[PDB]
């Protein structure tokens, strides 16, 4: 189950796939968990999302060194907010090649983030343009449309039952869609459904702020998003 490593938590989800979890204290609200992914692809490791901070992200890399002990070939971050991109400097200090939606890199300075080194662009169907995501191995990057933010992207892991919705998707019992300050209220529902349609055989849905769930996370997120229109 959960492996505590310093102030972070790591959970194996499948062969070659682990979830990383980091926490940021919010006075009057609580300590908020944020989840990303670590994937071993043969002799290298791929990371989805930073932790909230550089220090926590360096701890992710320390855990990888202890538990996997293979080079981290790249990281892809799923939108330009702190829970997904706050540790970019730690990745760069470690010499890891970093990738984000072109729009995330454009937004990064004003959002207080450090931009990734490389920009992903997307075809009209939402799939990443392959030239912009070289050597991504089993990572299948998909832009579902605007939802939690205008730049949110999602990632499936080929060879597994796992798809990652980042902050776009909430769990099947979530009370609400949470912070909608940067959200696209008109398009959220369709964007959530587009994520599910891009990864139709994914039975384990991973997300930023809940434990992995069934595909009911997708249907429930979309049904709540219907109310925004």
Ligand X SMILES: O=c1cc(CP(=O)(O)O)c2c(Br)cc(Br)cc2[nH]1
- Binding-site residues, in ranges, read 54, 79, 81, 83, 89, 148, 167, 209
Is residue 180 within the footprint of ligand X (CB under 6 A)? no
In whole angstroms, the minimum distance from the beta carbon of 209 to ligand X comes to 4
Is residue 131 within the footprint of ligand X (CB under 6 A)? no
Binding residues for ligand X, rule CB under 6 A, total 10
Is residue 187 within the footprint of ligand X (CB under 6 A)? no
Report the candidate in 208, 206, 221 with the shortest Cα–Cα distance to residue 175.
Answer: 221
Of 193 and 209, nearer to ligand X (C-beta) is 209
| Among positions 47, 139, 167, 204, the unique one binding ligand X when judged by CB under 6 A | 167
Question: In the numeric block, which tokens belong to residue 62?
Answer: 């320390």
Provide the angle, in degrees to the nearest 10, between the axes of the packed helices 188-198 and 216-226.
Answer: 160
**CA separation, residue 59 to residues 139, 158, 178, 210, 215 (Å):** 23, 26, 28, 21, 31
Report the candidate in 79, 22, 74 with the shortest Cα–Cα distance to residue 53.
Answer: 22
| Among positions 86, 208, 212, 222, the unique one binding Zn ion when judged by CB under 5 A | 208
Q: What are phi and psi of 127, to 5 degrees?
A: -75, 140
Stretch of 18-26, 75-83, 97-105, 195-203 lying at the interface with Zn ion (CB under 5 A): 75-83
Please give the residue ranges that form the binding site for ligand X (CB under 6 A): 26, 29-30, 32, 83, 167, 178-179, 208-209
């Amino acid at each position: 189950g959960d492996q505590r490593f310093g102030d972070l938590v790591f959970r194996q989800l499948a062969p070659n796939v682990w979830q990383h979890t980091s926490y940021l204290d919010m006075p009057g609200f609580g300590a908020v968990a944020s989840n990303g992914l670590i994937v071993r692809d043969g002799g290298r490791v791929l990371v989805v999302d930073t932790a909230w901070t550089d220090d926590q992200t360096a701890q992710i890399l320390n855990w990888i060194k202890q538990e996997i002990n293979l080079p981290v070939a790249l990281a892809v971050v799923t939108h330009a907010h702190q829970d997904k991109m706050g540790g970019m400097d730690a990745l760069h200090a470690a010499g890891i090649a970093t990738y984000a939606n072109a729009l995330s890199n454009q937004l990064a300075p004003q959002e207080g983030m450090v931009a990734a080194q490389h920009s992903l662009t997307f075809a009209a169907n939402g799939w990443v343009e392959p030239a912009t995501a070289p050597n991504f191995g089993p990572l299948k990057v998909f832009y579902p449309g605007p939802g939690h933010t205008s730049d949110n992207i999602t990632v499936g892991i080929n060879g597994t039952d796992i798809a990652f919705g980042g902050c776009l998707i909430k769990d099947s019992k979530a009370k609400s869609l949470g912070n909608l300050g940067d959200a696209d209220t008109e398009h959220y529902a369709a964007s959530a459904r587009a994520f599910g349609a891009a990864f139709p055989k994914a039975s384990m849905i991973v997300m930023s702020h809940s434990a992995p769930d069934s595909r009911a996370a997708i249907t429930h997120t979309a049904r709540m998003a219907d109310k925004l229109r």
